[PDB]
Amino acid sequence: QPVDTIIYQAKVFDGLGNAPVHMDVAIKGQQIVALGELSAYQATEEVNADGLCLAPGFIDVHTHDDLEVLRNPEMAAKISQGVTTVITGNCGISAAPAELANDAPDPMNLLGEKAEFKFAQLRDYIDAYKVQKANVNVAALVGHTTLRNNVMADLLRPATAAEITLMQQQLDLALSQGALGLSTGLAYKNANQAPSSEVHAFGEVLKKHDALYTTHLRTEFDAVLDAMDEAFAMEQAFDIKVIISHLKCAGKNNWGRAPELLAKFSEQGEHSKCSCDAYPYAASSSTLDLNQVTDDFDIFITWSDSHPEMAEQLLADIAKQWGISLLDAAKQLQPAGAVYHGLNEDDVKTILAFDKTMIGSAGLPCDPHPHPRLWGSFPRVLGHYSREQGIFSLATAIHKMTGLSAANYRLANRGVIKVGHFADLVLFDADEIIDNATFVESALPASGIHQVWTNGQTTFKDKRVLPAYSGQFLTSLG
Numbered sequence: 001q002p003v004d005t006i007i008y009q010a011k012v013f014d015g016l017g018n019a020p021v022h023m024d025v026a027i028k029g030q031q032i033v034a035l036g037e038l039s040a041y042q043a044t045e046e047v048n049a050d051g052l053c054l055a056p057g058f059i060d061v062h063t064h065d066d067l068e069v070l071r072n073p074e075m076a077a078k079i080s081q082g083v084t085t086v087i088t089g090n091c092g093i094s095a096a097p098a099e100l101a102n103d104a105p106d107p108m109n110l111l112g113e114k115a116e117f118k119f120a121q122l123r124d125y126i127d128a129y130k131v132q133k134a135n136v137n138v139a140a141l142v143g144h145t146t147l148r149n150n151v152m153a154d155l156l157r158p159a160t161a162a163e164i165t166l167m168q169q170q171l172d173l174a175l176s177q178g179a180l181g182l183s184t185g186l187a188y189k190n191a192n193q194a195p196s197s198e199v200h201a202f203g204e205v206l207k208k209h210d211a212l213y214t215t216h217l218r219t220e221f222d223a224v225l226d227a228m229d230e231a232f233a234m235e236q237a238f239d240i241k242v243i244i245s246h247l248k249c250a251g252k253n254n255w256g257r258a259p260e261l262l263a264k265f266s267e268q269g270e271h272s273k274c275s276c277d278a279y280p281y282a283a284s285s286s287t288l289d290l291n292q293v294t295d296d297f298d299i300f301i302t303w304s305d306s307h308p309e310m311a312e313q314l315l316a317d318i319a320k321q322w323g324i325s326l327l328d329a330a331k332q333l334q335p336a337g338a339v340y341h342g343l344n345e346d347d348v349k350t351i352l353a354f355d356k357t358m359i360g361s362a363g364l365p366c367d368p369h370p371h372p373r374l375w376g377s378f379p380r381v382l383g384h385y386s387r388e389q390g391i392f393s394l395a396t397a398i399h400k401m402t403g404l405s406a407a408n409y410r411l412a413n414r415g416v417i418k419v420g421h422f423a424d425l426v427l428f429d430a431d432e433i434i435d436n437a438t439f440v441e442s443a444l445p446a447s448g449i450h451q452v453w454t455n456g457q458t459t460f461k462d463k464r465v466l467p468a469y470s471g472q473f474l475t476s477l478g
């Protein structure tokens with residue numbers, strides 16, 4: 001009869017894009033137990049949300065937090081943005097199922113150091129998660145590149161049919177053990193020689209488990225539209241849910257092509273369930289890639305193992321100091337991290353406004369000077385693009401990081417403020433919410449978020465990240 005907590009008089013967004021409704025929200029244990037008029041109800045704790053907004057906890061659909069959640073269960077970078085659930089294992093790289101013969105192949109170093117990959121089966125990863133749990137829920141995809149590395153010593157080639165068969169079985173086992181689906185990162189060196197038929201070889205296993213396919217496209221530059229055909233073909237052949245990761249048209253050649261990306265979804269054929277996600281910035285981030293070096297836009301070096309004295313500098317400035325070309329400078333800087341200001345802001349706005357588009361940070365948790373998307377993505381959508389820019393309403397912005405995302409990833413009883421769903425919740429000031437992380441100060445926490453609950457326990461409150469550790473591993477339904 002009594003409940004743990006009642007949030008009073010918040011402006012409540014249900015997560016479905018519907019208009020907010022002023023009402024009260026009752027939490028008991030892990031669940032939203034009552035909605036609406038709750039002065040009758042008996043609550044241990046009472047939260048005065050007057051002048052504030054309540055929304056479902058934010059679902060970061062594009063993370064590389066596979067190992068971060070284990071090293072850093074508090075997950076301040078995500079929790080301080082209001083993120084209550086992370087989707088791990090993106091762009092073909094995951095922490096499990098993985099056995100490392102030698103070093104971790106590029107770009108698996110984005111996840112952690114070689115010694116951290118102790119999860120040969122997915123269940124070992126889940127068990128590792130369950131030791132402490134974390135402030136966020138975890139739903140895990142399996143990385144295609146990671147699977148290739150399990151069965152290939154030389155990755156600069158297609159897998160053999162027999163290697164494909166091994167990987168199928170590894171994926172199938174991972175899917176049975178809880179994984180949500182498969183991800184690829186076909187633009188990366190160690191996956192790029194994987195033909196489309198190799199990716200196709202996973203479709204029957206995915207369909208069997210009613211699992212997801214997500215893809216960092218084979219290219220995001222001139223031939224991005226050809227690369228999207230590959231993703232759609234997965235959906236056409238197998239009728240599975242497909243999500244194109246951090247949708248963009250990168251490169252000076254391609255600025256203004258966002259309408260073409262949108263119209264490309266008209267070529268899906270029979271089905272039309274393909275989705276996508278983006279981060280709210282006109283700059284990408286990854287390791288320094290010689291193929292992306294250009295003087296067409298700013299490229300900012302975030303770290304260099306060869307030349308750490310040149311970290312946090314523009315490639316053009318490093319090149320000038322060094323008396324050599326940008327490409328030659330980049331070569332001497334490798335291995336290195338970079339922020340590539342390769343995208344056009346109007347393209348970003350259009351891709352963000354696209355109703356298929358979920359918000360994902362693509363935060364890189366191992367970068368010593370991260371792209372600020374690691375710390376600002378979700379409040380930037382809410383404060384910058386919604387409130388300030390007016391690209392979309394607050395209900396729309398919230399929908400694209402809660403209900404749309406729970407639906408597309410089939411996260412049961414999450415992403416929506418509804419009775420009987422889990423109490424992942426964020427309490428924030430619609431007028432104050434904003435990202436503070438800049439390209440210079442990229443770990444500055446966002447403003448305007450007052451309180452976060454993961455599964456009914458408070459993981460953030462009044463600028464403090466709290467180690468409730470109430471997240472769960474969200475195992476796939478099958």
Ligand SMILES: CC(=O)N[C@@H](C(=O)O)[C@@H](O)[C@H](O)[C@H](O)CO
Pocket residue numbers: 091110216220246248250283284285286292340342362
């Ligand atoms: C880890 C990761 O996948 N990062 C991508 C991103 O930040 O969007 C990046 O690799 C981009 O694909 C390229 O820089 C071209 O834009």
Ligand SMILES: [Zn+2]
Pocket residue numbers: 090091185216245246
């Ligand atoms: Zn990617």
